[PDB]
Amino acid sequence: AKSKNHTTHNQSRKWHRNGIKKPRSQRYESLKGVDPKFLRNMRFAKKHNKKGLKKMQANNAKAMAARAEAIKALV
Amino acid sequence: TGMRGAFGKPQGTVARVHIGQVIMSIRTKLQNKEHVVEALRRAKFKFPGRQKIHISKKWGFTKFNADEFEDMVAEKRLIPDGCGVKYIPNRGPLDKWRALHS
Amino acid sequence: FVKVVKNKAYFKRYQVKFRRRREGKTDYYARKRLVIQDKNKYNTPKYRMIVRVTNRDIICQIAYARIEGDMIVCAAYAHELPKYGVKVGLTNYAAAYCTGLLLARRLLNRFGMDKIYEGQVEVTGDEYNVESIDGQPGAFTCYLDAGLARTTTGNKVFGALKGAVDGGLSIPHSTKRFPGYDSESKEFNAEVHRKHIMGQNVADYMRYLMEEDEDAYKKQFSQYIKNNVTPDMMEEMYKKAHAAIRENPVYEKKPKREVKKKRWNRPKMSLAQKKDRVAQKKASFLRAQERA
Amino acid sequence: ENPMRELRIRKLCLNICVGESGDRLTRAAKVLEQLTGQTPVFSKARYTVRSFGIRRNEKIAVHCTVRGAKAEEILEKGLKVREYELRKNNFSDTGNFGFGIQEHIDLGIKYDPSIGIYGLDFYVVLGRPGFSIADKKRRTGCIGAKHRISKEEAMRWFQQKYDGIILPG
Amino acid sequence: GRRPARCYRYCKNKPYPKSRFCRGVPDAKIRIFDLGRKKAKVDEFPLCGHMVSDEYEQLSSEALEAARICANKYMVKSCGKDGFHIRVRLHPFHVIRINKML
Amino acid sequence: TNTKGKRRGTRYMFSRPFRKHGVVPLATYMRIYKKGDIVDIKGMGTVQKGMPHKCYHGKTGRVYNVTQHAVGIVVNKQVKGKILAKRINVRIEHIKHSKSRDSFLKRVKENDQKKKEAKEKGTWVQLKRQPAPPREAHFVRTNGKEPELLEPIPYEFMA
RNA sequence: GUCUACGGCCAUACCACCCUGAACGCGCCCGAUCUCGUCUGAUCUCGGAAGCUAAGCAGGGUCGGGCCUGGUUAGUACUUGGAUGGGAGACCGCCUGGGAAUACCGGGUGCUGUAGGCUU
RNA sequence: UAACGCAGGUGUCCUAAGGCGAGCUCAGGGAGGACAGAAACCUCCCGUGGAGCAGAAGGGCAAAAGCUCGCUUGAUCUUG
RNA sequence: GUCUUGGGGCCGAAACGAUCUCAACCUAUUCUCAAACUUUAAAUGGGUAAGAAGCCCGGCUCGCUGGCGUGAGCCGGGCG
């Protein structure tokens, strides 16, 4: 049956009675949507630092000690 | 029809005026000041509202104004053409206008 | 009469092309695709082989574009060929091949890969392969950059191409346009091309004019006979050139002269030489009209 | 003028608007073929106007574009039928002139009882060296302003060369 | 019917001029916007009389027909028949809608 | 009144400002985009592919996905109560680099430079941009002259 | 001073004209065996160097059309916020602040990146 | 961001009107040519979109996204 | 201002030769407008950025990216 139509004017009070207007900006945003060809590689570069003990950081271990020895002479 | 759908269909035609718009304008000799000033109030009665009447400072219907106008016509910057006067500026190639006519 | 097309309004409503296309030299449709890198190759440059023919010179360049202007890695003009052993004919097909052979050699000698990636000395029927070592010498590349995109079998620009590939560059192409390609059989020939690449058709041309008429022969090749080059030495001269280009690809950039500040038409007329002179010029032309 | 300004016939164009396709046209192409020795081309319709007998893309006319030395001799025979006589309205304001001849045989064609009754249309394009610079693709430009052809500049060349005159009309 | 101009006096709608989207508009009851001695050169009549509005209102093109005549009908009796020059500086453009609701 | 649609009311949004029609100048393409930098989205009507939706004509974000011909963007578009962070994909020749952040990475360098140059003065030059101070009382020279006497002009009723 | 090849900005780069040229540097151009496309070797393609700056192009000029940037127009129009301000009403003045556009009148007429020549 | 506000369109059409590449440039106007006329066909010139792109309108476009040619089926299969 | 024009005509070639005369045109001017027109174009308004989620160096990793560059990611060190 015949009746009245709407109106929309408390849309702003309810709006801000509560309601934080930020999406919680955050470090380590998820990798959802990146190029799969690009992403496959970055899954490999991780894979060959997470695999083994002798290959990678044996180069890291030596270079750090030089970083350890070089800086101390200044003090 | 019951106002179930009421968009009007046209009739008549109207014109709008803003405060300061000029409705009607008359040219005449300088000796007919009074004939203008009261003929317009005779016209004023066929209009809604109230309209002021005054005599312009502008020579004729031209863009240009009271008694400095006769100098430029003598100075050769305006030329009479029918109901109006052309402004002769200097950006135009007047060395090809003066060469045409001093 | 009828309304003039060029009104005061027409100019107000105008829209100039891009300047280089207004002069007609650059095709901005074949540049959007032959220059621009993809966006995950962020700064890896894209190299082009700009090969242009002029009425009396052949130009070859290798470039990669930047946000401001282009960058020219190397260039090998064709009018340095009097240095090497060839004098007559620089718009020849073979001349282009002499250019495309030098441009690679000069470019590769810059980058240290001259001793490697040599290819055939002279036969063109095949592609030439590469090797890639990460962050170390190997596998040069580029793409052909024709100007106004005219491309029909036998075109001079494809003289440089066969020169480039044999020079050492690896250019993705197909032997569908080397002259001698039969248009309706679609076969590799490489023999009609071998004559074209070596200028042996011109040597045939002068042997053609010998039999028929010397009077027409003199009109055509009057400056072949100056510093006499007969047909029988034509391929011999070029065979020396391709040898000659290899040992000395380097360029020395002859030094320039010293300016005495010459001008022969008229000075660069600035505001004052415009403002004061023309404010005179009226006051002068004004004076004539009040004096007559 | 000097050697770089000598006027020449850039081209000469001939056509026959036979009106209706079929056989009368495909006979007409012979007439041009007998004249210039080049295979002609058929021009179809741009529009359809039924008050002529034409249809859209109906092959209406055959035209040709002779050139160089071949053109000049065709003009020598072509002008002779008009006995080297023209008028001042035959020279366009853009430096071209033209005319026509009512019968094909008058040029040097041999009449045959199988041949129909055909005329054809003449039109001469003057030009000066450098007029090709408006057609080049690699870099183009205008033709010029003092190197163009005025109305008179066409007539005074024609008058001296073929000895003819122009009868005012 | 009458449709007295009290209804369409204020300016209470967006401009709705005669265009391709509004067909069937009649012709305005005013057609001759200039009358008098129209050929008069600008040297002739240097006394330009104006009428100026003072309310941001709408003037019906019915009125402009009768205002033009009324002021013209006087000047003819005063100056002569080629002694003045009248220009209506207003044109009726904005068509106005009506609705019959019985 | 009207209804939904992908490009409704974008008669002027994507209208190629009215003295520039034709191929997009090629300094748009060599501009290299990288993860984590700020772009401002601006629609263009010459492209028609990957155009940002009309709602995003002006909102700015940072590119997290760089592809061959396009760069994904994190944008802040608000539905009623929730300012979402919506990922979209646009072609490069719509968006352009933002000069907002670069006006900050410019002053980061100098502030650390001045501080490191002032490690030998022993004082701390002041932090960023105290707001605009009051006008710092001074004198005004007026010797030899006199101020003009301003006054209102009379009423002149023009036409 | 300038040119050639590739370009960035895309008219202060355009358009109408008129004047002068800094190795054929660019072009005009002489021909059609071969490559190649045409009704036509005009275009496209190919082979050259007898001439030519007349044309393209470059530089300059027009109290030029245009174009860019200024000035007046104007603190006008318009407007955020306030009043128990005026007015029957159309509308208007005020306080607080922000603030334009034609007419008209001046100035300006390309900057430049890489590679390569010329001192005419 | 609404009303039985406004001016309109759709339930289809395409083996090409899809995909490339090449070569051209349109609408409109002027001056010239046998029949030929305002209105066929031939040539030159001017021509910043004034044409066309299936249709409603808006947007877009001139060495194209328009016109004409040559080859083809990316109008195919599968994940997100 | 002069091309097709007329209407009144004059001559009897013919009168847009001329001349009266209106006229469709073209040229510069002028009066007034636009929600579905627009070169210009505000007020109010909409995102962003305002530091440790940073500034900076040294090293390592790749089945993608290739001039020798790499882009991404990992370690380590000084300034909050």
Report yes or no: D61 and D42 within 8 Å, Cβ to Cβ: yes
Of E49, E64, E96, the CB nearest to B25: E49
Q: Residue C74 CB: number of other CB atoms within 10 A? A: 20
The per-residue b/e assignment along D88-97, b for 16 or more CB within 10 angstroms, e otherwise, is: eebbeeebbb
| Nucleotides of chain G touched by protein CB (<7 A) | 1-2, 4-11, 13-22, 24-30, 33-37, 39-40, 42-68, 89-92, 103-110, 112-120
Terminus-to-terminus CA distance in chain B, angstroms? 74
Cβ atoms of C181 and C208 closer than 8 Å: no
Burial grade of E60 (CB within 10 A; 0-12, 13-18, 19 or more): buried
Q: Which nucleotide is nearest to C31 (CA to C1')?
A: G7
Q: Given 3-state DSSP classes, what are the helix, strand and coil percentages for chain D, each rounded to the nearest 5? A: 30, 20, 50
Nearest chain F residue to C27 by CA: give it. Answer: F23
Q: Which of C156, C163, C158, C126 is nearest to C238 (CA)?
A: C163
Burial of A10 (0-12, 13-18, 19+ CB in 10 A): exposed
**Residue in A19, A23, A33 nearest the CB of F84:** A23
Pairwise CA distance, residues D107 & D36, whole Å = 11
Tell me the CA–C1' distance in angstroms for F4 and I32. Answer: 40
Name every chain B residue with its beta carbon within 8 A of the beta carbon of F159. 22, 54, 56, 58
- CA pair distance C38, C40, nearest whole angstrom: 6
Contacts of F69 (CB under 8 A, 6+ apart): C38, C39, F91, F92
- DSSP for residue F155: P
Listed residue (F55, F92, F93) closest to F75, CA to CA = F55
- Output phi, psi for C188, to 5 deg: -65, 130
Taking CA atoms, C34 is separated from C39, D115, F31, F70, in Å, by 15, 58, 16, 18
Q: Phi/psi at E46 (nearest 5 deg)?
A: -95, 10
**Parallel/antiparallel/unpaired status of strands E47-52 and D61-66:** unpaired
Distance, in Å, from the CA atom of A73 to the CA atom of B29, rounded to the nearest integer, reads 107
**Nucleotide with C1' nearest the D71 CA:** G40
Quick check: C38 and F69 CB within 8 A?
yes
Using the CA of D140, which nucleotide's C1' is the nearest one? G56
Which residue's CA is nearest to the C1' of nucleotide H46? C5
Binary contact (E54, B51; C-beta < 8 A): yes
**E-D interface (Cβ pairs under 8 Å ≥ 3):** no
Beta pairing class for D85-86 and D165-166? parallel
- Separation of alpha carbons F62 and D110, rounded Å: 84
F81 touching A, CB under 8 A? yes
Greatest Cα-to-Cα distance within chain B, rounded to the nearest angstrom = 76
Closest-CA distance, C204 to chain F, in angstroms, reads 47
B90 touches chain C (CB under 8 A): no
Compute the half-sphere exposure of residue F76: CA atoms within 13 Å on the CB side of its CA: 13
Nucleotides of I under 7 A from a protein CB: 1, 3, 25-36, 38-40, 45-51, 53-55, 58-77
Q: What is the C-alpha to C-alpha distance for residues F40 and F59, in angstroms, rounded to an integer?
A: 6
Nearest chain B residue to F158 by CA distance is B56
CA of D136 vs chain C CAs: smallest distance (Å): 10
Q: What b/e readout covers A37-64, taking b as 16+ CB neighbours within 10 angstroms?
A: eeeeeeeeeeeeeeeeeeeeeeeeeeee
Nearest chain B CA: its distance from F159 CA (Å): 7
How far does the CA of residue B102 sit from the closest CA of chain F (Å)? 35
* Closest-CA distance of chain D to residue C55, Å: 12
C1’ H36 / CA D168, Å: 23
Query: Could you tell me the distance in Å between the CA of residue F16 and the C1' of nucleotide H58?
Result: 14
Amino acid letter, residue C195: K
Question: With a 7 Å cutoff on the CB, does C289 touch strand G?
Answer: no
Interchain contact D/C (3 or more Cβ pairs less than 8 Å): yes
Q: Give the integer Cα–Cα distance in Å for C92 and E32.
A: 80
Chain F residue numbers with beta carbons less than 8 Å from the beta carbon of B58 are 159
CA to C1' distance (Å), from C20 to G16? 22
Chain E 42-71, residues with CB within 8 Å of chain B CB atoms:
42-64, 66-68, 70-71
Strands (E), D52-136: 61-66, 85-86, 96-101, 120-127
Chain B, chain E: beta-carbon pairs less than 8 Å apart: 254
How far is C-alpha C12 from the chain's CA centre? 39
Instruction: Please tell me what DSSP assigns to residue B3.
Output: T
Separation in Å: G29 C1' and C220 CA: 13
What was the experiment behind these coordinates?
A: cryo-EM
As a whole number of angstroms, the distance between CA E68 and CA E80 comes to 17
Residues 23-52 of F with CB under 7 A from strand G: 25-28
Helix or strand holding residue C286 (H, E): helix C271-289
Q: Do B102 and C290 touch (CB under 8 A)?
A: yes
Which residue in the block uniquely carries the two structure tokens 């990636």?
Answer: C117
Phi, psi values for residue D29, rounded to 5°: -60, -25
Give every CB contact of residue B54 below 8 A, 6+ residues apart in sequence: E50, E52, F157, F159
Using the structure, give the distance in angstroms from the CA atom of C35 to the C1' atom of G5, rounded to a whole number: 16
Q: What are phi and psi of F96, to 5 degrees?
A: -145, 165
